[PDB]
Amino acid sequence: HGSLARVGKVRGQTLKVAKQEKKKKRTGRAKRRMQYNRRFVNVVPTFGKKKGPNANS
Amino acid sequence: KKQKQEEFKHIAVFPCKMKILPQYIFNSRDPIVMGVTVEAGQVKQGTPMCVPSKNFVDIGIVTSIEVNHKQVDVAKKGQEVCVKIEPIPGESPKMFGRHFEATDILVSKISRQSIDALKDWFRDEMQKSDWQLIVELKKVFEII
Amino acid sequence: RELVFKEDGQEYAQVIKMLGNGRLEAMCFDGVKRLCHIRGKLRKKVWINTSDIILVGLRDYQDNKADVILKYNADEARSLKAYGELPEHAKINETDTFG
RNA sequence: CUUUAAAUCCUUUAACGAGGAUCCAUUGGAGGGCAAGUCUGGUGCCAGCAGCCGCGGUAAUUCCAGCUCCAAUAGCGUAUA
């Protein structure tokens, strides 16, 4: 606890999780090429409702 | 500093423990002129004065302090002084032998704002014994 | 049930006068009158009466406003007065729930 | 080499000049308006978010961090007329 007026407590007592070494994302023209391929090339005919691009069910 | 003393001198009540001499009584009411020894603390002119033994009855404010016919403003511990007490206007004036007697120990009626002024601005002029008298009267006056 | 104590910035106080608009003033045990606040967990669940012992939080940048944490009942206030976390001259005045 | 008062800048042109091409693309946001996780940990009407509705009460799709995703892109966010 400490006090009700402790400033910045939740920023200061949360756990520190380090970053992850990830691959360089290509930016510019080929990113639009990847977006076009993933949207309008690899589409499969489904039924009902299409899940979102971040649908982590 | 002298100017700030001049405005805030009316609020600052100095601590005191001061003891009535038997039969050294020269007046009874309006004014009360009476020869009293100072057991502890120091007396300053304009002090509100009270009796703890009779449910914190107030006798009035002092006007003039005389040490063997000499007008001395400060009456310190160990000195037998003559104190002239004027009753507070608007209240009932007090008599000797009915509201208070010779066996009573009369103390200064300090206030919380006076304690604040003594702690904040009058830190230089008060002794450790005077601060102990302040704490003792604060437990007597039931001030938290 | 438990006896929570003070901390390095948390002290004790006694309510003097009940105040409107979800606030109160309480007499701290240092000689300073502090305007306290009712905690949002205490706005309807439990009530605070006049002259009761409560736990109060403080601000480290000002001393004009404060905030109440919890409230002590009669037996635990007497037990904490017996331990010595409270001054002996502090009048608890037997705060209790009547019938 | 060219330019120019003389340079510098651009263009031309020798020699060197990249693989995880570390020669590393940021700014906001993910409940609705309004494009985009009912993911995983911490606090528990506190800290804070929130232009507006509103979100936090010891299982937070809105807080604080990690992964993924979304909008524009050498640009993006905020305040005022």
Place this chain on the structure above:
RNA sequence: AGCAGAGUGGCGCAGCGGAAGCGUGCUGGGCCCAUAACCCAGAGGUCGAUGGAUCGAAACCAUCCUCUGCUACCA
């Protein structure tokens, strides 16, 4: 140094010969979902004390005690 007013239930008060009462406060119960109002009961009295005038005293008288108002009389 002294005078005047008062002393009855926790508080204020009526109060005089054939008589411990009033308003408020406290506790227990009922009524209501609960509180106040209301209803039913109870607790709490040296009538400040002593002595006398009396068949009959809280009352008529004398003294003392306590509280509140007054003569101004001091460094």
